[PDB]
Write a protein that binds this ligand. Structure first.
Ligand SMILES: Nc1nc2c(ncn2[C@@H]2O[C@H](COP(=O)(O)OP(=O)(O)OP(=O)(O)O)[C@@H](O)[C@H]2O)c(=O)[nH]1
Ligand SMILES: Nc1nc2c(ncn2[C@@H]2O[C@H](COP(=O)(O)OP(=O)(O)OP(=O)(O)O)[C@@H](O)[C@H]2O)c(=O)[nH]1
Ligand SMILES: Nc1nc2c(ncn2[C@@H]2O[C@H](COP(=O)(O)OP(=O)(O)O)[C@@H](O)[C@H]2O)c(=O)[nH]1
Ligand SMILES: Nc1nc2c(ncn2[C@@H]2O[C@H](COP(=O)(O)OP(=O)(O)O)[C@@H](O)[C@H]2O)c(=O)[nH]1
Ligand SMILES: [Mg+2]
Lengths: 50, 426, 427, 426, 409
């Protein structure tokens, strides 16, 4: 019974089965977006320089 | 998968069970030899509940015959469908109790019941998922009442989480075959209220009344009475054997009809049951099944429910029917006669339909009502018990075997508080 | 985009037997599973020319499942999908929720996972259950609990059968309905009620069938689902998805109970002598003689309504028709909501199945609304549930299974609290 | 290839062997005249294990009848399958011992044992790869026990590497034919513990009890009892004679059931055994065979195995069956009844499957349990032996023949140390 | 290029009787098999069933070696007493089989370690093969006894005494139990009452899938020397869990949509391993994936990515590239009377992990309990052994347990 209770509370704590992949894939996509944005900002600055 | 092991005790149990196995085997298309000869594939899908395939189409019934005198055992093997039972399932004593509940419960039971238990164990472990046990016996005799009741108590402490049906005819003053009927009935009911899950009350008086008016039989031998009882038993467990639009299993019926753990005595009826002279003038619709179902002169007990109140009721329908019609008929009979029903429970009737009629009819039904009027039998029996026991009649045949006086007083108290407790919820 | 449909109980998988029948007869697939791209929402393709439905039938009693295994559609369903137990819950909510449920729902979960994994753009789930029983009530609520913790953001369309007010088959069903709603409240995102007496009256009056069995009931339920997924399956002049109902119809996260209706339910003879257009079916979708739940929205007030239109329907007249409804005064909307409608038109007409009693109609309307008349039904359930609970009838079965007296009182006051919630939003 | 030379001693050995050669000759399809007449090819390629091709298709058995009284030889030669033996193999004394172990072991054996050894040697080297010898005798009689025991010792001196089976019946007090049973059985066991390779213990109580209860015979003569013992002996050497999915020869069974060199007394059982009236009321499955196998009331010894623990057990199956069912059934009985098995040995059950059933049956089984309940009989015998020997009853009939008092004390010593080692390993 | 197969014992040649049936049914590509085999056993009953069977003329008469009498579940008997007279005849034939060959990839041996012939003379054959050739690979697909399902009694004694030589003689050792295969046939093949024949049929499927790269041209071929590097990170750690997918019936196969992504998954769940052990307790050291039939490198590439990103199973900290793929074009063949349906594509996975460290530990107690009381030891000692080799084989498995625990960290 105690092990069953610990199982249920840990099961609720993981926040779902698919939760880990979504958070992992979301932060990875976020990495890509900042990289893309940084390139456009660099281009504007270098264009301003010329 | 869902499985019922069958147990027949005493002479009453053996004839009832004999006509019962003929009716079921004929429904599943198995001939007296025991080989399959039916046509429909549907008949083969659900033979695991009552039979075991042996070899080459041979189907053996999952039943156990238990008695004390060999006259009943030989009468079983003589008749048709007698060659289908496994001869090892004829567990059997030799001496005989003879209408002495103490002899049936203390002396001869103590050496036969280990044997019948061992057969039951093999029959229970031979199958996979028990639904329950099915015991048919009487309450007046000795080898059925005392031994069978001991078997019930022993089994209930072995498998406590499975259902258990017991069909018991009870004695009445108008049909008084033995002299010590109350001394047997009162002690037997004391054990049934504390052990059995649900009981189905029967009596021989009502069966004689059915054979006079409804059947209009000339010579109602015991074969026809056993025929009516068999049709009821087949009708209640038809749901496990055949599919339907609304299936209702034994456990589903038990929880739907028993509001309190001590209120498990039902009166049963079956329809259609008509004479050959009037079977030609009849129609087969739902209202004609209901108004012959709920008639008081069709109950198989001598306990008129309108002298009490209905707690719950149930109807098991068989045949291609329209479920709307089923529900509106139960609604009509509950709204008109509202006084006969309990008030603090709406919709007192559980209903179910199965799509396989019995052979010979197009549409049938089976009624199981848990009324409070069953207490008429308890008072009716207890006064005869009191009338002898105040004066110590026939007592020494019970006393000199191991029973003392406080057993009768405890049995009196429990039966008396039971009829009192039925009266309070009434 | 894909949606998978799960069926729990005797009533659940019987409803599925009518739905998948309707589906293959609509997309031109024989019952064996082969054609003689819009089927992608419901059927996955083996690649060998065989189409398999996205569904799992599960229950606790093997009787109703195994006639399906041997009907005409033996070869349509994948074998693993048709889950089956060994013994029934027997109209006992606790027995389906703690004793027998705890062994079977984990098998259903690790099945439903690979149905979702085969999908790509999963729109949601949609569940079928009748709350009067033990399987559909007990492990249904248990399954919804574990579904909410697994996915959460995905829609769960609950098409439930509530017990009728007067016409009932079981006797412990008041207990089962109250305890089940206690969890169906905070798990199902969008829960549609389908009574039984209302469908009975529709087949008696509209279809003029005086002897209906369960077949016709399940038939018209599949018709409503087909009318609701046509917007997802096919292209129309104005379409909606299943995520649209989550926002457009439920104002508060605890008021999600919708009254469904469909029009026109017309026999083979009235259609020949009668006229079909958009205005009259827009009318017929609102009258209480065509509702699927025994309640009267005339007693209630509308929050928001939804209107599925199928067939040869232009958008000008659906607007004109809904305008005429608002100018009438028999039905009124809540003060907080000036606009109370969500309309939708799709091009494909409803197909017919041979053997059914639905005519081939040129046009049809499926209305799904939200109101406060639903508050009267829940209150009506509380009177007869509380009626028996005080004397502790039938409590011994549930408490013997492993429950106590605590959950009755705490579930009772939760649904009682819901009664007060419905009354305060209506003001 | 592998060869089995047969040796029968005494009246018990001759009549048991007569029924044995009847059933083996029918299995290999040989007529009572000695010529092959079978149907399947399988019955030809493995008859050299039991027969020798003489000339013109004359297959004569590789057997040696041995006794001291001509009544048994003439009764053997009279009946069918009596004219298939070589008359030179009927090695035969003339005087007779008569239930005197000393006569059969020191006086009369001294002039016969030379002739039997001549015949068995010539009959042994006639074949190429000997597997072992197979002896059938008793432990109550004199010319069976004493001479057969002396022959066992001499054979183990010459061929010390070859196997040795001994089907020996032991006396029990409930069926006590002679008066000097303890004096014979105790001395006979003293030689069996050091000479035989394994001994399959038999008894008449269990045999008579089996034919009463399970077979339900009315008049169980020696023919039926000898028929049962022969069916056991055919089952134990079916692996050599027929191909199977898993083979187990004599040596293979010996190493898996004997954990210590002096612990080689087995109990035997044969299945299926059913009454003629109930032969068609049953299935033929592996679980059914297992329930009849592990029944304690089915051993062919009068020693209840549930009075002790099993050290090891063996099951030889015959028939087309699934090996998984075999292992699952053995594992199931190993887990549920955990107390009856020894703990510091997992896997107390060796199993094997042959593909050819005995003639007339579909699937059969043979059980050989090496249990520690066998020590009760040795105590059951030693208490009788001491009862006589405390007071020198009947002692002079043996003393005036050569045995001294140290021989009986030595026999008590070996019996007592043996029962202590069974008690040790329980 | 050719590879010859040796079969020892009752289990060995029955596995071969199914394996060679598949080879003839499957077939210049034949050159690697056409047979280059040897059956050998001490009991003549099973070999002479082949001599009279349907494949009478297929096998050259000398090939089928057969002794005079059985070792009788006795490792010492089949290794010291009876082996000594038959092993010389066997290996002095296998030599001329190799001289017939020119480009020998290796030998592959089939034996069950529970018995005496499969275990005893198995190790004896292996020891003279290792000193004679040394460099040539010898793949040993052995059958170890299951934990709870068992047919013999003294098999712990045999399994330990056989393993002590299976370490340093074979190159690549694949475990296979009977309970795990029984579970596979019960779960996936839904055969509730299986026999040895069905087990041997799907064992042949695994063997065929790992030699099909030599026989037929694929997109990415893999030889027997390739497994030698890509799966054994240490010279004494070569014990491989096996799996196969899709093991599926005739009707279910059509209903389901077999593809590359899901079968790469199905080949990784413990519900489909050929050895009764749970790799959730262990960490994968390396994996090897043989793909047969209709496979493009993209989806196999995509599938190994999803496995690596899952967290239900873990790898050792040492291998970021913990895989070895292999693709062959010809689909797997079917046998009439077989239960496996025809599939466009199949996957045979051979991994290496620390879950195997559990089976040895489980084995130790059963052997330990019996040995402490000296049960059955008198049979083996009188055969020619002593107490020395019992205790020393015991401590060899003790070292192996510490070895797996050390490498797994
Ligand atoms: N609308 C509709 N309702 C149905 C149908 N069949 C059964 N029901 C309803 O289902 C309710 C009882 O539940 P069932 O589905 O029959 O049984 P269950 O939910 O599986 O519960 P158990 O009997 O314990 O297995 C009844 O009150 C019926 O109203 C149907 O075909 N159509
Ligand atoms: N997979 C499989 N395993 C088998 C088969 N036959 C026997 N075995 C295994 O072999 C083990 C015992 O060894 P056997 O092959 O039967 O006999 P052996 O190895 O030749 O040794 P001996 O009996 O002394 O001849 C058992 O544990 C079985 O699990 C088979 O056909 N298929
Ligand atoms: N319905 C029916 N009742 C029977 C039959 N035979 C006996 N009885 C009843 O059995 C009662 C007497 O019980 P008895 O047969 O002596 O029971 P037993 O001695 O314990 O087996 C009587 O009241 C009869 O009504 C029968 O064939 N059918
Ligand atoms: N089963 C069986 N037992 C027998 C037979 N003949 C004798 N016996 C048993 O043998 C014992 C006597 O052995 P006996 O014939 O005197 O042996 P012998 O004098 O040395 O040949 C008795 O206890 C009998 O029960 C027989 O034909 N079958
Ligand atoms: Mg072998």
């Amino acid at each position: 019974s105690e092990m069953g209770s610990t199982l249920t509370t840990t099961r609720n704590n993981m926040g779902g089965i698919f939760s880990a992949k979504e958070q992992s894939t979301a932060v990875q996509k976020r990495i890509k977006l900042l990289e893309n944005r940084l390139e456009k900002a660099y281009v504007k600055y270098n264009q301003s320089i010329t | 998968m869902r499985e019922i092991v069958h147990i027949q005790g005493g002479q009453c149990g053996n004839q009832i069970g004999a006509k019962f196995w003929e009716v079921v085997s004929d429904e599943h298309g198995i001939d007296p030899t025991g080989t399959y000869h039916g046509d429909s594939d549907l008949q083969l899908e659900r033979i695991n509940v009552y039979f075991n395939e042996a070899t080459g189409g041979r189907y053996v019934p999952r039943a156990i015959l238990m008695d004390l005198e060999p006259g009943t055992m030989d009468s079983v093997r003589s008749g048709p469908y007698g060659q289908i039972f496994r001869p090892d399932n004829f567990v059997f004593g030799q001496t005989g109790a003879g209408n002495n509940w103490a002899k049936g419960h203390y002396t001869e039971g103590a050496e036969l019941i280990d044997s019948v238990l061992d057969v039951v164990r093999k029959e229970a472990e031979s199958c996979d998922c028990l639904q329950g046990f099915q015991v048919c016996h009487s309450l007046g005799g000795g080898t059925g009442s005392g031994m069978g009741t001991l078997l019930i108590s022993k089994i209930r402490e072995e498998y406590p989480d499975r259902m258990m049906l017991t069909f018991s005819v009870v004695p009445s003053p108008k049909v008084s075959d033995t002299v010590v009927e109350p001394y047997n009935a009162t002690l037997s009911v004391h054990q049934l209220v504390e052990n059995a899950d649900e009981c189905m009350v029967l009596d021989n008086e009502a069966l004689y009344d059915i054979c006079f008016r409804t059947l209009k039989l000339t010579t109602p031998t015991f074969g026809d009475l056993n025929h009516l009882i068999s049709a009821v038993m087949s009708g209640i467990t038809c749901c496990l054997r055949f599919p339907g639009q609304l299936n209702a299993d034994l456990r589903k019926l038990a929880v739907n009809l028993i509001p309190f753990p001590r209120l498990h005595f039902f009166m049963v009826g079956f329809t259609p049951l008509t004479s050959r002279g009037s079977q030609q003038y009849r129609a087969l619709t739902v209202p004609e099944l209901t108004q012959q179902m709920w008639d008081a002169k069709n109950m198989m007990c001598a306990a008129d429910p309108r002298h009490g109140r209905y707690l719950t009721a149930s109807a098991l329908f068989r045949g291609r029917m329209s479920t709307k019609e089923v529900d509106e008929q139960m609604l009509n009979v509950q709204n008109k006669n509202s006084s006969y029903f309990v008030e603090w429970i709406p919709n007192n009737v559980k209903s179910s339909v199965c799509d396989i009629p019995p052979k010979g009819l197009k549409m049938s039904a089976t009624f199981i009502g848990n009324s409070t009027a069953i207490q008429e039998m308890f008072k009716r029996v207890s006064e005869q018990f009191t009338a002898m026991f105040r004066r110590k009649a026939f007592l020494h045949w019970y006393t000199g075997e191991g029973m003392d006086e406080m057993e009768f007083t405890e049995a009196e108290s429990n039966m008396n508080d039971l009829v009192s407790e039925y009266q309070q919820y009434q | 985009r894909e949606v998978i449909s799960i069926h729990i109980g005797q009533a659940g998988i019987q409803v599925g037997n009518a739905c998948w029948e309707l589906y293959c007869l609509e997309h031109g697939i024989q019952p064996d599973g082969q054609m003689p791209d819009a089927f992608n929402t419901f059927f996955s393709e083996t690649g060998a020319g065989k189409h398999v439905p996205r569904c799992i039938f599960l229950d606790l009693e093997p009787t109703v499942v195994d006639e399906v295994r041997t009907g005409t559609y033996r070869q349509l369903f994948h074998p693993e999908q048709l889950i089956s137990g060994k013994e029934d819950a027997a109209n006992n909510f606790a027995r389906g929720h703690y004793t027998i449920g705890k062994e079977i729902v984990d098998l259903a979960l690790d099945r439903i996972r690979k149905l979702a994994d085969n999908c790509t753009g999963l729109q949601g789930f949609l569940v079928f259950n009748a709350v009067g029983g033990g399987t559909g009530s007990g492990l249904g609520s248990l399954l919804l609990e574990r579904l909410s913790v697994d996915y959460g953001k995905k829609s769960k369309l609950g098409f439930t059968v509530y017990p009728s007010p007067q016409v009932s088959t079981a006797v412990v069903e008041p207990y089962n309905s109250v305890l089940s709603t206690h969890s169906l409240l905070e798990h199902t995102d969008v829960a549609v009620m389908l009574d039984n007496e209302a469908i009975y009256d529709i087949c008696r009056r509209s279809l003029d069938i005086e002897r209906p069995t369960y077949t016709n009931l399940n038939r018209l339920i599949a018709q409503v689902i087909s009318s609701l997924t046509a917007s997802l399956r096919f292209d129309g002049a104005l379409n909606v998805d299943i995520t649209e109902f989550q926002t457009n119809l439920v104002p508060y996260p605890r008021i999600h109970f919708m009254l469904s209706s469909y029009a026109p339910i017309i026999s083979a003879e009235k259609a020949y002598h009668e006229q079909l257009s958009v205005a009259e079916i827009t009318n017929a979708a609102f009258e209480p003689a065509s509702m699927m739940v025994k309640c009267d929205p005339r007693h209630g007030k509308y929050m928001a309504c939804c209107l599925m239109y199928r067939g040869d329907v232009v958008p000008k007249d659906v607007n004109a028709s809904v305008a005429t409804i608002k100018t009438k005064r028999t039905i009124q909307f809540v003060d907080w909501c000036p606009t109370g409608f969500k309309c939708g038109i799709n091009y494909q007409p409803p197909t017919v199945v041979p053997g059914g009693d639905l005519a081939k109609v040129q046009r049809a309307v499926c209305m799904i609304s939200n109101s406060t008349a639903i508050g009267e039904i829940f209150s009506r359930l509380d009177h007869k549930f509380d009626l028996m609970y005080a004397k502790r009838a039938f409590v011994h079965w549930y408490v013997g299974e492993g429950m106590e007296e605590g959950e009755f009182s705490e579930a009772r006051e939760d649904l009682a609290a819901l009664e007060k919630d419905f009354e305060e939003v209506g003001a």
